[PDB]
Design a protein around this ligand. Structure first.
Ligand SMILES: *[C@@H]1O[C@H](CO)[C@@H](O[C@@H]2O[C@H](CO)[C@@H](O[C@@H]3O[C@H](CO[C@H]4O[C@H](CO)[C@@H](O)[C@H](O)[C@@H]4O)[C@@H](O)[C@H](O[C@H]4O[C@H](CO)[C@@H](O)[C@H](O)[C@@H]4O)[C@@H]3O)[C@H](O)[C@H]2NC(C)=O)[C@H](O)[C@H]1NC(C)=O
Ligand SMILES: *[C@@H]1O[C@H](CO)[C@@H](O[C@@H]2O[C@H](CO)[C@@H](O)[C@H](O)[C@H]2NC(C)=O)[C@H](O)[C@H]1NC(C)=O
Ligand code: NAG
Length: 870
């Protein structure tokens, strides 16, 4: 059966043959409607209303609604349907609604999240949403009651619930969708034109395609209208899946196992929706201050002598960099928890030299543990202890450990979901730290990557390894570049918990960090990610390529991870794969200075690409130094945004639409971004370019370098950015805290502080500032910090300390206040502490050309309150 109207509307057709080229026979065989088309974007075979479920009996509970569902008895799709299914609603908060669909007569796999708590009460009354549930056929419908706009409309297609194929579709109210990962999107706002996005954790070079990559994030967000009203949709399921987007727009989930567990999250602004999502899934970890310093790295330095030569040439070029990373070449025959005693002879002395300069040292750690013997024939202690404690992932029998292959040849895999394994791991890092004093860890190969397909002895041929429906994952082969789908772990079968491996290792390393650096924050950088891995680790965008495309795409990739609540994120500056250009790398170093996580990294064999390799008096070194210096100056501001992220769930690097949603031009913009609300970063992203077409939003902007008020507002301009400049603007209405830069955060942190006041329209400005020791894990939780509020109006600045419980912070002071965009010239400056009367201040400069005032040599000590008048 087909729609009564002959020339029906095509954008509402839900594809009935999603895995294969449509044929009339298979269409009929599935009981769907056959009606071919001029192109092959539009489905030729679609369920009109032929598949689905009906409600028979539904009741009310205190929390929401239970409903028993029965399969409308159409033919099967991929077999093993479940005829009798249970729908459950939970009105969790006034802002988030949750529904789930389960098998009453069997406990199906449910993601064993480590933060998402079970909900039972209390009952929330007066919610912002409204849930209508159609009866025949079943469909859910979520409505914003405020204005009656319907957000999530299941009525548009069937529910298909079979043992290995799950399908539900939803009509959305606008054409603006953001998120889903990890893939290369290229553009921040989604193309709606019939696109599949496969999600399944996987080791793969990011390129121009829809391949599933390192992380598994199902969250997407959507802006309803010009008032900023938005919502988000998160599906809690870790099986392989496709998310399909088509015009109207109707998004469709096709998933290979588990249950359907949806959360729908309302907000007043896009910023609020992202906050709501992090509330549910976990707020991001607060980083250590030194995490924000610049990092140098490469795969295969070959020897400690080359590492040394790189460090000293960069120190000499005056490049600010806090940390030195060291890839698998530091290890002995690429074995975890060892170091090459020959080519990396003298490592602990070198580590000592780093610490002597106030620098830090990060090592890579892979999950795979070698079955082999050490160099001089001795038993490999890590492997031996692993056996003793039975730490490994077993084959389908549940006894024999599975054998893959990674860097050191054949290997076994730790089951980081085992509480014994987390102990073993923590122990290994503790033992190793006594030999080599690392400062932080970088966990790689997280996806569970294997160089061989499946296992050392291949895969058993079954429904788990060769499922009835495979989504568009690379190679269309589940066990490709990973382990057998029937492998057993403590949380479950590989088929179910595959995408959770990287997640669990981040958790395991967060414990390991507490054993090694008691009560410190350290550093954990992870590759694979699941929902709310922000809570445990930092992420970088993987193995990119020295390529202008790839540099452009990193912005929209970084902004997506901001949505996913992993704020400490960056790409590999200058390009991992391939040799980089002087020109490309000069530009990427400018942009890279403004990634939340800022690190230059390179692949094996290609020429060096660290800044100082391009020449001590090179334009690249001059530029990089200048902008890394700007970065370091702004670190107090950045760090404060990270505090706000950790506490309220705000974004650090945010897209322009988050602040300027009243303008529909901001909705599509993704070639520039912001640090929080105040700083606008506009990079050069085309080869050879001298100029860039930039959309400058609806506010007052000041050039960061000069301080001059730009004559631009709510318009597109041709911004002139020569070989050494990158667009930096401060937004009027904001006060940002800065601190005199140095070449390490260690050194910079004891330097005098300062404020920048970008005045805005009504001659107002607001700002905040958070300061602690930047490393102790529980400072926020124990009230051991300083917190400030800034306020300007009537040509007078108020510095208000709202909390003060950190003694070593009292020694620092704001000693410099720069005020941009003055309406009238200045004669006298007066300064008062607390509420004492104001004395005159001599040291100041007024520049009538730029309307800039800079007040020098003050002594506004952290801890106390002050006023400054001009
Ligand atoms: C930053 O700088 C400005 C200085 O301009 C200060 O704001 C002014 O505040 C004063 C009082 O401190 C205001 O003066 C009074 O305004 C009344 C109008 O009140 C409403 O509207 C104003 C402006 O929109 C609001 O600010 C205010 O809250 C009210 O909502 C007048 O009616 C008053 O006049 C009285 O006397 C006249 C005769 O002289 C009679 O006609 C009336 O009956 C009445 O009795 C008075 O003028 C002033 O309006 C504000 N300025 C402006 C232009 O907005 C801020 O105080 C300062 N910031 C700080 C915190 O110091
Ligand atoms: C994989 O197999 C190992 C060994 O075959 C299992 O280890 C058992 O673990 C418990 C608790 O650590 C011990 O008391 C037993 O000594 C172990 N059994 C034996 C016979 O060695 C392990 O549980 C299996 N792992 C998973 C998750 O399947
Ligand atoms: C496709 O078919 C429709 C309906 O018959 C028609 O209106 C449309 O123009 C066709 N497209 C092309 C490319 O001819």
């Amino acid at each position: 059966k087909c729609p009564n109207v002959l020339n029906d509307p095509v954008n509402v057709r839900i594809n009935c043959i999603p895995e294969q080229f449509p044929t009339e026979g298979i269409c009929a065989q599935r009981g769907c409607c056959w009606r071919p088309w001029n192109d092959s974007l539009i489905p030729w075979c679609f369920f009109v209303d032929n598949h689905g479920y009906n409600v028979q009996d539904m009741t009310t509970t205190s929390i929401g609604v239970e409903a028993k569902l029965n399969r409308i008895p159409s033919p099967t799709l991929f077999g093993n349907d479940i005829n009798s299914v249970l729908f459950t609603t939970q009105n969790q908060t006034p802002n988030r609604f949750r529904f789930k669909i389960t098998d009453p007569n069997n406990r199906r796999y449910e993601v064993p999240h480590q933060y998402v708590k079970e909900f039972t009460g209390p009952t929330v009354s007066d919610t912002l949403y409204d849930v209508k549930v159609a009866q025949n056929p079943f469909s859910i419908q979520v409505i914003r009651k405020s204005n009656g706009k319907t957000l999530f409309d299941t009525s548009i297609g069937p529910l298909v619930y079979s043992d290995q194929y799950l399908q539900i579709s939803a009509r959305l109210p606008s054409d603006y969708i953001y998120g889903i990962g990890e893939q290369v999107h290229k553009r921040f706002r989604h193309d709606l034109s019939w696109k599949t996005w496969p999600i399944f954790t996987r080791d793969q070079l990011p390129g121009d395609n829809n391949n599933n990559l390192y992380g598994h994030q199902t969250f997407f967000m959507c802006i309803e209208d010009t008032s900023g009203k938005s919502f988000g949709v998160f599906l809690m399921n870790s099986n392989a899946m496709e998310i399909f987007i088509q015009p109207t727009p109707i998004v469709t989930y096709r998933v290979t196992g588990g249950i359907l567990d949806f959360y729908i999250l309302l907000g007043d602004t896009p910023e609020q929706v992202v906050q709501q999502y992090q509330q549910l899934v976990g707020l991001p970890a607060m980083p250590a201050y030194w995490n924000l310093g610049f990092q140098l790295s490469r795969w295969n330095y070959k020897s400690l002598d080359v590492v040394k030569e790189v460090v000293r040439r960069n120190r000499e070029a005056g490049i600010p960099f806090d940390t030195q990373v060291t890839d698998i070449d530091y290890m002995e025959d690429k074995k975890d928890f060892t170091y090459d005693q020959v080519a990396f002879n003298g490592l602990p002395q070198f580590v000592q030299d780093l610490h002597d300069h106030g620098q830090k040292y990060v090592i890579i750690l892979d999950p795979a543990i070698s079955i082999g013997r050490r160099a001089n024939g001795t038993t490999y202690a890590t492997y031996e202890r692993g056996n003793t404690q039975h730490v490994w992932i077993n084959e389908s029998d549940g006894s024999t450990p599975i054998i893959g292959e990674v860097w050191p040849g054949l290997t076994v895999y730790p089951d980081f979901t085992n509480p014994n394994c987390i102990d073993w791991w923590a122990n290994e890092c503790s033992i190793f730290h006594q030999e080599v004093q690392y400062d932080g860890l970088w966990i790689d190969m997280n996806e569970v990557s294997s160089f061989i397909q499946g296992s050392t002895k291949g895969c058993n041929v079954n429904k788990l390894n060769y499922p009835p429906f495979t989504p568009d994952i690379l190679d269309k082969l589940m066990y490709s570049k990973t382990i057998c789908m029937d492998a057993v772990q403590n949380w479950g079968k590989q088929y179910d918990v595959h995408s959770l491996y990287g997640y669990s290792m981040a958790i395991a390393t967060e414990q390991a960090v507490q054993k090694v650096f008691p009560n410190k924050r350290s550093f954990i950088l992870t590759r694979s990610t699941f929902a709310g891995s922000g809570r445990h680790a930092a992420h970088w965008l993987g193995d990119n390529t020295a390529s202008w495309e790839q540099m452009e795409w990193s912005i929209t990739g970084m902004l997506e991870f901001s949505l996913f609540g992993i704020p400490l994120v960056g790409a590999d500056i200058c390009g991992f794969v391939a040799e980089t250009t002087e020109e490309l790398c000069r530009r990427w170093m400018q942009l890279g200075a403004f990634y939340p996580f800022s690190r230059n990294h390179n692949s094996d064999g290609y020429e060096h690409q660290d800044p100082a390799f391009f020449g001590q008096n090179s334009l690249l070194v001059k530029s990089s130094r200048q902008y890394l210096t700007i970065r370091y100056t702004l670190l107090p501001f950045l760090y404060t945004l990270f505090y706000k992220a950790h506490v309220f769930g705000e974004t650090v690097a945010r897209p322009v639409l988050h602040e300027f949603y009243e303008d529909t031009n901001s909705w599509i913009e993704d070639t520039e971004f912001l640090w929080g609300p105040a700083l606008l970063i506009t990079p050069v992203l085309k080869q050879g370019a001298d100029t860039v077409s930039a959309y400058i939003p609806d506010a007052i902007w000041y050039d960061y370098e000069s301080g001059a008020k730009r004559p631009w507002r709510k318009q597109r301009v041709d911004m002139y950015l020569p070989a050494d400049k990158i667009g930096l603007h401060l937004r009027g209405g904001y006060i940002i805290p800065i601190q005199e830069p140095d070449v390490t955060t260690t050194a910079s942190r004891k330097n005098p502080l300062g404020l920048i006041v970008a005045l805005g329209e009504n001659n107002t400005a607001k700002g905040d500032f958070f300061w602690d020791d930047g490393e102790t894990k529980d400072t926020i939780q124990n009230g051991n910090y300083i917190l400030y509020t800034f306020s300007v109006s009537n040509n007078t600045l108020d510095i208000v300390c709202t909390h003060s419980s950190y003694q070593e912070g009292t020694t620092l002071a704001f000693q410099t206040v720069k005020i941009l965009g003055l309406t009238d010239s200045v004669t006298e400056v007066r300064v008062a502490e607390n509420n004492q009367p104001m004395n005159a201040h001599s040291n100041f400069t007024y520049d009538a050309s730029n309307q800039v005032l800079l007040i020098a040599d003050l002594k506004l000590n952290l801890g106390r309150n002050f006023s400054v008048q001009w």
